[PDB]
């Protein structure tokens, strides 16, 4: 069933739906989920959601199409900016706490880290390490303080870092970056002070093959390095590190088989997510048993902010790639995702399952219908529809789950009833149609399943009692509430019920009772000058009347013959009999050979 975390997320989904269906302007998913890390005690989920929130606060699609946005350059600039800022504030908190101001914070961390070195020290601390680590926190004004103090062994770095903090894309003049590269490989690369090389690297986008394992030991640090290093400008084509190349690099090294095997999923996920690719992150994180719900709800959050490149066609993969994108990212088969998440607790606690189901509403299907409907129509039938799912009629509809977030339920009811109808679960669909206030459909459906049993004898362990009570309750509700159905179907229904009672009395053994019943039906000959109209009466009789006329006529003939043998009146009786013969003598409708055989046999025998 559910876990406390699962039911917690669930309740929150309830709340978001009660928001969107009420017409309130509310905080979107990401906000609720963010706060839903301190309602229950945790440590990591909080961090994941922090990352998600910070990474989704972007200018949302400065275009008209999601693909355009998620492949435009400026969009990726926004992504990398948000990402960098998150990493940097993260590391800032990490040090600021683990050390137990900023300018001396980094200083103390250096002192509690490490006690050839280029360009000496200031205040007794090596300048290059100071510069690097104080940039690492995303604070340049401290680096500005340093380069104001430390200014006597540089002066190219001075204006370098100046025009670094002058363009908001952190890009220098082209020739500036080029002379930085030229000085780097010519006097800087071959040095024994790595830190200086790392600083010149990030500040000048140099040597995109270096990883600096010594100073950026941590995977998070590695992300910092490469993202601080990536470039969208085209300066040389040999140190141009393209963000798509980095996404491919990470997808290579991290994930696609390495995710589940390394038993540190949260961190891997933050990696795969900070790199401007959401789909392939959730798709992995969704697989591990520990972090199913967190992945699924990150996906829902993303979808609600319309930040998702979902699968347009229908396939059998969760994460898919359609060989048309420039690079894009693997598309996420959103529908299959919701399905393969709900199916765990769908057939046990469907109340909450229906809640997730709602989100697929505007996502069409193969047939041309909302997938949401073709989803409910399975849950509600294979989990034995209750009133809590739809409701119970009397003359008044009981509110159900589907009511609480959708108006005009009659739509959903008609749909699911038709679906269960095609499925061959007919009786249940009759009940549903009745819960929908649609008389013609209820009655036409009951017609079929009523037709064949109307002459089957009492037969203990049958359906007759059940369907009889069903149709009787139908009659009560409809004739009492003044509900009237289509004439040619209402008529056939009431004829079928009167015939039910007639045959009950017949089987029971009341001759004259059933006889006046069959008289007052005008289905069979009563006078030799009316049989010509009897022949005209049908050609409007549906298959129902056909599928029993045989036994109707047979039973009637039985009544007549019993009266005759048990009996002047026999003239009238046998005249009615030969009229019946003439009737059967010209029926195009259903019969059997033995039907007319017994008919004419009893006829000539009573003669």
């Amino acid at each position, epitope marked *: 069933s559910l876990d406390n975390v699962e039911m917690a997320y669930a309740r929150q989904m309830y709340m978001y739906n009660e928001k969107v269906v009420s017409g309130h302007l509310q905080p979107s998913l990401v906000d609720l989920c963010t706060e839903a890390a301190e309602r229950l005690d945790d440590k990591n989920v909080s961090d994941l959601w922090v990352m998600v929130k910070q990474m989704t606060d972007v200018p949302l699609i400065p275009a008209s199409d999601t693909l355009k946005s998620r492949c435009s350059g400026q969009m990726q600039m926004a992504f990398v900016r948000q990402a960098l800022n998150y990493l940097e504030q993260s590391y800032k908190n990490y040090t600021l706490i683990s050390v137990f101001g900023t300018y001396n914070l980094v200083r103390s961390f250096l002192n509690i880290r490490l006690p050839g070195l280029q360009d000496g020290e200031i205040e007794g601390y090596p300048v290059w390490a100071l510069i690097y680590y104080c940039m690492r926190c995303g604070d340049l004004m401290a680096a500005q303080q340093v380069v104001n103090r430390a200014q006597h062994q540089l002066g190219d770095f001075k204006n370098c870092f100046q025009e670094y903090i002058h363009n908001k894309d952190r890009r220098l003049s082209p020739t500036t970056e080029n002379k930085l590269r030229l000085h780097y490989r010519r006097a800087v690369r071959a040095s024994t002070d790595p830190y200086k090389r790392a600083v010149y690297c990030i500040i000048g986008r140099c040597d995109v093959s270096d990883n600096h394992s010594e100073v950026a030991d941590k995977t998070e640090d590695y992300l910092w390095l490469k993202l601080s290093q990536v470039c969208f400008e085209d300066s040389s084509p040999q140190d141009r590190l393209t963000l798509p190349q980095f996404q491919k690099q990470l997808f290579e090294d991290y994930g696609e088989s390495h*995710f*589940a*095997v390394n038993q540190q999923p949260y961190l891997y996920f933050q990696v795969l997510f900070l790199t401007a690719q959401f789909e392939a992150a959730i798709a992995f994180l969704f*697989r591990l048993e520990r972090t199913r719900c967190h992945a699924v709800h990150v996906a829902l959050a993303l979808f609600e902010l319309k930040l998702l490149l979902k699968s347009t066609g229908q396939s059998a993969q*969760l994460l898919s790639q359609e060989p048309g994108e420039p690079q894009g990212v693997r598309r996420l088969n959103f529908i299959r995702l919701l399905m393969l998440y709900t199916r765990k607790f769908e057939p046990t606690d469907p109340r909450e399952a229906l809640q997730y189901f709602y989100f697929l509403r505007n996502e069409k299907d193969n047939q041309g219908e909302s997938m949401f409907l073709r989803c409910v129509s399975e849950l509600v039938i294979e989990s034995r529809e209750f009133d809590m799912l739809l409701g119970k009629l009397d003359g008044s509809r009981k509110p159900g789950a589907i009511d609480k977030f959708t108006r005009d339920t009659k739509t959903i009811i008609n749909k699911v009833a038709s679906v269960a109808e095609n499925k061959g679960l007919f009786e249940e669909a009759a009940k549903l149609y009745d819960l929908a206030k649609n008389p013609d459909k209820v009655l036409e459906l009951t017609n079929k399943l009523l037709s064949p049993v109307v002459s089957q004898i009492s037969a203990p362990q049958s359906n007759r009692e059940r369907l009889k009570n069903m149709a009787l309750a139908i009659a009560e509700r409809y004739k009492s509430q003044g509900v009237s159905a289509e004439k040619s179907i209402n008529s056939t229904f009431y004829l079928l019920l009167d015939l039910i009672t007639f045959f009950d009395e017949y089987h029971a053994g009341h001759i004259d009772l059933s006889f006046d019943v069959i008289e007052r039906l005008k289905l069979v000959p009563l006078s030799q000058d009316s049989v010509e109209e009897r022949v005209a009466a049908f050609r409007n009789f549906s298959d129902e009347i056909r599928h029993n006329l045989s036994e109707i006529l047979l039973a009637t003939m039985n009544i007549l013959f019993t009266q005759y043998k048990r009996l002047d009146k026999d003239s009238v009786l046998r005249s009615q009999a030969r009229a019946l013969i003439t009737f059967a003598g010209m029926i195009p409708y259903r019969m059997s050979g033995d039907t007319n055989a017994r008919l004419v046999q009893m006829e000539v025998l009573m003669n």
Partner: nanobody
Amino acid sequence: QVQLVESGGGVVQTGDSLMLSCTVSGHTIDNWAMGWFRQTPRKQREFVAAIDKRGTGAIYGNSVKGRFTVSRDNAKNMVYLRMNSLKPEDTAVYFCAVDQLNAGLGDVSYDYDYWGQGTQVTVSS
């Protein structure tokens, strides 16, 4: 329909080593991943092992870490689970299912679509 045969079970004794096999019936397993689960009366289903589509690396369950081995032979279209140092609880029917989702190495039952029928095993201590 692409069915499966999940065979190699039987009754064995404690501390022995059992080789459970599975053979695909009607497809080429080079895109899919493979998974060996077990059905006990303890639960309805649990996880044992799952191997990716490259035949290189696999995830082992919550308790069985460091006692089993799994492999897939694309050239033989077979799935192999060889065990060591069994436990009384392992009297169970082991299933071998297929992963198409084309991502990761799932460890939850529902993620897989097709199945064989199972191979029953019974350890007698």
